[PDB]
Symmetry: C5
């Protein structure tokens, strides 16, 4: 994730111009290799036309260039590209919204699971750790960065998210499918035990805990579903082929023809195809943004910071349910007890 | 479902190029027959023009080709195609999101339905089996793969989702409509019985169970509704006719005319209509993706894996509510009890 | 509703081609009269130009035809048509999703309203009948098919949805607005009475019943709102005028001019305007789909089957709450008690 | 609101043609003045060109007309207009969905607030009146029609929505912001008092009442937010300028030039610019629909009927909670106790 | 926020024309500098062509101008601009909807937290102050205006949102991440303490309080997420480059060429490029609206009034939970106890 929100707080004279000088998470970084390859192929073809082909071969090549220039518009590059990019971007934001967070669960646990002794601390910490463990399992299933951080369940145990006994129970479970849900069932069982023990004082509190757990588990399952159901491969292949074929055609149709031949619209020999290069930049860059966003759990610059989120979530949950439990400041009267540096359209 | 999420984790130099070599769930697989038919018809027309027609017939054919080329643009192929494909894709993702899953219900049941003896196991297993049976019934109603797996209710009984006594009750019910909902009413009655028996310990737990059951049943009903209310047949017919008529016109208008006739824009005889073939590839491929996604419960490569989901859901639910019930590891202090391989825009 | 989901389960070679042979709920059925009128007017104008007008009149007519052909593009037919059709289609699916269904309510009632005697049956049946009656009232308010089935409240009473005493109470209520909500208030009062009587055993059950009732009543109210707030009449008039004016202009601009006059682009006299007819087919068909879908409660082939839904809902609700109440099969061990015909991207 | 749903129940031969004869809430009503002004300016320019300018001035004017005709396409009228209209229409439907309705609250109150004596009637009536008063306050804040009906809080008191004592409390509250929320806090306090008094019999009933109150208050707040956060003024100014500049350019570029000058595409002098007038009609009408819908609480024909809704809501709420409370017909066996005028795709 | 809802209540003859005279929050204010720079560069190039270049240099410049004019269309300015602006506008409205509001929480607190003595006042005021403090913390994290108002936590303490003891607890918490959530955990702990003390009378009331708290905290977290996950920098760079390159090309291609050279379409020398300036105005203005809306928490005229909202929310919450608690007017019979200044489509 490359954040630039602060730079664009206000619309200024050189507002978006300053952002053109950024390299990390930039379009130049994503596309310079492809732009170089396109320019090299175009230059090779141009040099062959200028210095290799004979006069008759040059005449035939000019006819072919005119033909390609006139008929390359038949490829609906923008038609397919726009739909594909819209689908990818919508999926991208939806996937970000599906990353589980323990904030609601930690607030509920701090408010509902009680006891200042070691057993109450154990209950709260274990519930939050079960939530975090389920999140870690799903993330290592769907994210390459998290998987690299946790290439085995032994790594998860050493990171403290799972214990050795929990590891034994986890591995002894006979199931050929992803087990990211197991900590959620552990959470349900532990919450039921706490309610039966009196640590959770009422049935409404247990119900709220279970509802928060279901929301968390649903976000984990949504992450799994997004990982499984990719964007249809047909769409990806179609857009890739459209872009590739269009610019392969432009390699010929956008060639500078000899101005002495009087061809319509071929009157200025600029050598470098500035506008063809700009069009390639824009279209290939659109597709490259789609490529980067299609799997936002990779290791691109603009991909989600899943490891940072794991660390932050675990730290915050443990703090909230252990250090902050029943640790309020005395009720004091505030500043305005005795009371800077629109009413409507019809009023 | 053809998953390629891992291949596209990062935006690489040859990122989407590698995906062009996939056959299963590809555009080539879906469209090679149609492309071959179009090319064969075009080649037949070209050969007839080149070797059969007389000089005057050729002149008239050239006039007709020019006429078709100039007036085939009147058919709004992209206008209708884009709207149709957008509608189909939105319905496709919505339908996937409507497939029932027992995860929330299994967590609630493991947390709320109690008893380590045979009766408690029976309660939990039967509740999860009722959910799974309702899902199986709706899926065999709407999915051809599931129906092939379960062509009769006898198959459902032999698969273990229904018992013989439940089968008798199910068949004795006098109703001419789909009975996918019957297991949900069984679930409600059984949950009420468990609460009255004391297995469910509080009214809040029963309420949460019923809410989860309603969510599950609502997803089943949404699957039924999507199966019933197809995309309007008028739209399908209109898009099919638009594509067919446009490319039937292109069969004539895209013909290579004799360059010796001096016709504007007919100067190079390439024989093979490369760009016409590419345009057909793209437009027909867009419509073929729509065709494959319109009913995502068929047997296409990219259709949903409903049988796999049935098996996974049943296995996971049974495991969670039977083997994992009240089977927690002792409360142990975690690694960080005593405590790898951004704050905001204004900070 | 014309359902063709099964025909399109798989993407086949002749996939959407087979659907072109359907008449009921087809584009041909909706548009053949208009296509015939357009063709007749075009043919009348063509015959007048060919056999009536004098040479000078023909020259002026040719000038007018060229003028109309060149300036008819100024009418943004697709621009307005696409937005209108998108709005109509979104409203159409939303309206279908707003049709009330008693499934959630029937499950809750079967689980919460108790008693195997006559009084308990009366309670459950009356609650479900109140829901069904409210749905019937709203549907006869908004649907022409339902209104034809129930042209008076006497018809509703004879259909069994309302009793004579309930009819007296309903008619004695002094209100000038639609009374579809009255059965919902009856439902609330009856549920409160049942809870006070002990038939509903806990306050949570009553709360769940009231929440389900509110969801049902909200769907009824949404149906009322969609019926009341039509698509803005300005949009309908604008799209109708755009289509009509565009094709009235095409009646002149698309005329076949005498090829002996050497007019640019008028070189082939085909008599029949194939592409103009195809363009009219597509655009007028788009508008006709909008026309059919704008009020989906009419009597079009693709309109919702409201009477079928009323019958199905009443039958299923009565069955679920009366015959299926406390009618479970004994708890039996299932097939897999002792245990056919993907893990992630990083795995 | 101009409702025409019944007229469009079925797709008929003259389906949308009949709607062209409606005046109230029509495009003609909204746009005839602007169309007349455009036509008058065009005619003035045409007369000046025909009868005032000298030959050399006419030649320069013809050059300017050709220049304007060719370069007026640079203004992206449709590009900005479509986005603006889509935004406005989405906001319009969202705003309609945000108008508070007392139906859910009245059902809950009739089911939960008890007592057939004067005190129970007082409780129910006062709760519903507090909801209605909050709605009235917000509506008079955001709607010009409601404000005209209630130009002062004295008008609200005389309408019966507020009492004199409540008025004293309302005015004594020291707050410089809109007070539409005050009746909701009164509702919360009164519901708490009723629960403490025993009129509300359980804590779940009070919770459901408070949840319904929060939904109602949230809709009121959404109305306030929509009133406050207008569509960005930049967008409105940009679209207005685009339309105005485009058609000011068309005033010159669409002029009929002398056919004797042989200018390309200027061969027929029709005097009246039929297609330019039609294009203005369509584009200006699109913007006028946006103008009418941008604030749907004004006094346009198609604006929401806020006063009617206020009256209906108050009448229905009072009826439901006072006359219909505990006023059920005896439990009678229905018609079908002893039992007119699809199963799936795979079946 | 520049509100103009009242000005546009009705569609009038000079409806949107009046809005063109507004300066604050206008397009002119945002874009006059850029328009001036573009005009100055164009004028410099024009003067150089007219008075500096030699005849041969002028011929080459004319060729280059024609080349740029014909090939500048290859840059898909509108294609990228529309998608970018749509994304930005959707994010803008979503971000506004995510600003936390205490209305629901204040209603719940006034209805559930009881006691007319000093301790009850302390409880209610402290709960609402915790909500407001969490909102202030997140807003100063994401908003530059709020941060300027509260550049340090000392400023927050002096504003009365935090106490000195709460400040000590807040700073002693060992966490490297944003602490906006800490007041929410304080709220949970304080609500639990109040319930244990009897101030909250039932478990359902505590559950409702915790649910409202979770909604509030979720909106705060959504604000944080929107601040963190910016619009992809690739999209911003691509749109900026597209606009800049297109209008840099127009600087040359839109030059007025010497009419004596007989160049096609260069016949009228107007000196000032009116339509090029209008096109720049529209496209650059679209991008400037995107720039202003991309971070709606800056200090633009149309940015959200976060400080006003903070003040209003605190004042209203304190009033509702302190002055308005248990402060109802006696239950009086209303005006209509004894009872101004549509039924459906089928009726
Ligand atoms: Ca990626
Ligand atoms: Ca399929
Ligand atoms: Ca209809
Ligand atoms: Ca209005
Ligand atoms: Ca800003
Ligand atoms: Cl609840």
């Amino acid at each position: 994730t490359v954040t630039y929100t602060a730079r664009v707080a206000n619309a200024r004279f050189g507002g978006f111009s300053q952002l053109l000088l950024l390299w990390r998470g930039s379009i130049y970084k994503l596309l310079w290799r492809e732009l170089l390859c396109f320019l090299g192929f175009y230059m090779a073809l141009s040099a062959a036309y200028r210095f290799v082909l004979t006069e008759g071969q040059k005449r035939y090549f000019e006819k072919l260039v005119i033909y390609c220039d006139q008929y390359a518009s038949l490829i609906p590059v923008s038609f397919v590209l726009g739909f594909y990019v819209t689908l990818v971007v919508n999926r991208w934001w939806s996937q970000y919204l599906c990353m589980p967070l323990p904030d609601a669960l930690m607030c509920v646990v701090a408010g509902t699971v009680h006891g200042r002794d070691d057993r109450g601390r154990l209950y709260r910490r274990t519930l939050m750790r079960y939530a975090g463990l389920s999140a870690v399992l799903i993330l290592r299933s769907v994210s390459t960065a998290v998987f690299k951080r946790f290439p085995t369940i032994d790594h998860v145990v050493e990171a403290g998210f799972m214990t050795r006994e929990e590891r034994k129970k986890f591995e002894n479970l006979n199931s050929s499918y992803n087990k990211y849900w197991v900590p959620c069932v552990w959470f349900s069982n532990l919450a039921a035990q706490a309610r039966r023990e009196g640590r959770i004082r009422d049935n409404s509190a247990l119900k709220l805990l279970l509802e928060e757990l279901n929301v968390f588990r649903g976000k984990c399952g949504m992450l799994f579903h997004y990982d499984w159901i990719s964007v249809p491969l047909v769409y990806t292949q179609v857009v890739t082929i459209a872009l590739y074929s269009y610019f392969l055609a432009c390699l010929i149709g956008r060639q500078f023809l000899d101005p002495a031949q009087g061809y319509k619209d071929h009157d200025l020999d600029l050598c470098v195809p500035i506008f063809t290069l700009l069009q390639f930049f824009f279209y290939a860059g659109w597709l490259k943004v789609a490529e980067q966003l299609i799997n936002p759990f990779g290791e691109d610059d603009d991909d989600f910071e899943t490891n940072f989120l794991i660390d932050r979530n675990f730290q915050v949950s443990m703090l909230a349910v252990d250090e902050m439990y029943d640790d309020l400041a005395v009720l004091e009267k505030d500043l305005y007890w005795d009371a800077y540096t629109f009413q409507g359209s019809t009023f």
